[PDB]
Amino acid sequence: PQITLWKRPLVTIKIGGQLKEALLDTGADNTVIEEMSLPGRWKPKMIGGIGGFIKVRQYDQIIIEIAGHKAIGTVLVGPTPVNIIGRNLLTQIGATLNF
Amino acid sequence: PQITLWKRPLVTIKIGGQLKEALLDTGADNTVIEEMSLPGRWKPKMIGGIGGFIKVRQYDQIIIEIAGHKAIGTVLVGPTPVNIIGRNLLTQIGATLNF
Ligand SMILES: CCCC[C@@H](CN[C@@H](CCCC)C(=O)N[C@@H](CCC(N)=O)C(=O)N[C@@H](CCCNC(N)=[NH2+])C(N)=O)NC(=O)[C@@H](NC(=O)[C@@H](NC(C)=O)[C@@H](C)O)[C@@H](C)CC
Numbered sequence A, B: 001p002q003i004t005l006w007k008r009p010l011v012t013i014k015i016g017g018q019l020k021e022a023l024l025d026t027g028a029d030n031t032v033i034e035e036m037s038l039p040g041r042w043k044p045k046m047i048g049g050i051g052g053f054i055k056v057r058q059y060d061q062i063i064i065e066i067a068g069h070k071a072i073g074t075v076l077v078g079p080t081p082v083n084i085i086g087r088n089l090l091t092q093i094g095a096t097l098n099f
Helices: none
Strands: A002-004 A010-015 A018-024 A042-049 A052-066 A069-077 A096-098 B010-015 B018-024 B043-048 B053-066 B069-077 B096-098
Touching: A042 A069
Parallel strands: none
Antiparallel strands: A002 B096, A010 A018, A010 A052, A042 A052, A052 A069, A096 B096, B010 B018, B010 B053, B043 B053, B053 B069
8 A cells, every 4th residue: 555644654463463553664673562472582672762762572583464464573572652663574565665 | 766674764864054864754743853053943842752752942944855855844953863854744755655
C-alpha cells in the first residue's frame, strides 16, 4: 500500500500471537515493542532518541506480521511509549520513502 | 526519488542558508533541528520521544529545503540527538511510505 503522512502511519501487527498497533518509523534503527513475553534468550540494550535513553531486552529471530506482511528480525522489548516498527523490519516488507 | 531503508534515510537540508543533514522520519509528527539561530519570535512546545520529553522552541513559516524540495513551515529547535524531518514537512514534499 501507499501510506500518506497526513496522520501517523499506524498499522496492526501480530507478534507473539498478540495483535498490537504500531508506528512505521523510518527514523528508528530498531523495532521496539511495549512490555510483552517473547521466546528465546535475550540481552540488555540501551536505546536513545528524543528525551534520552531507555533500557530494553533484545530478542533475535522474532517473526512479526506487519499489515499482512511477515518479517523476521531482532525485536527490542521495553518501556516504549509507542510500539515502533524500525528499519530492520521495514526493509524486509519492502518499505520505501517516495517523493 | 525512492529511498530504501537499509541505511538511515539521511538527506541534505538547507535552512538559514546553511546545509545540514537530517533524517526523513515518518515516526515524527514534527520537524526538530539541533541548536541554531532562526529569525523571528518563537513559542514554547513540549515534545516526546523514546526516552521522555524535552522542551523546544517553535518557529513558524520557516523556509527550508529538503533533499532539493522547498518547504515552508514549522521548525522546532532544541536538544534533539539528530535533525529530523517530520510529517509536517514530509507532506509538503509529497513523501509517502510504500510497500
Ligand atoms: C531523535 C532520534 C531519531 C528519531 C527517533 C524518532 N522516534 C519517534 C518514536 C515515536 C515516539 C516514541 C519519535 O521520537 N517521534 C517524536 C519526534 C518529535 C516530534 N515532536 O516530532 C514524535 O513524533 N513525538 C510526538 C509524540 C509521540 C508520542 N509521545 C508520547 N506519547 N510521549 C510529539 N508530538 O511530541 N528515533 C529513535 O528515537 C530511535 N533511535 C534510533 O534509531 C537511534 N538513536 C539515535 C539517538 O539516533 C539508535 C542509535 O538507537 C529509537 C526508537 C530506538 C530505535
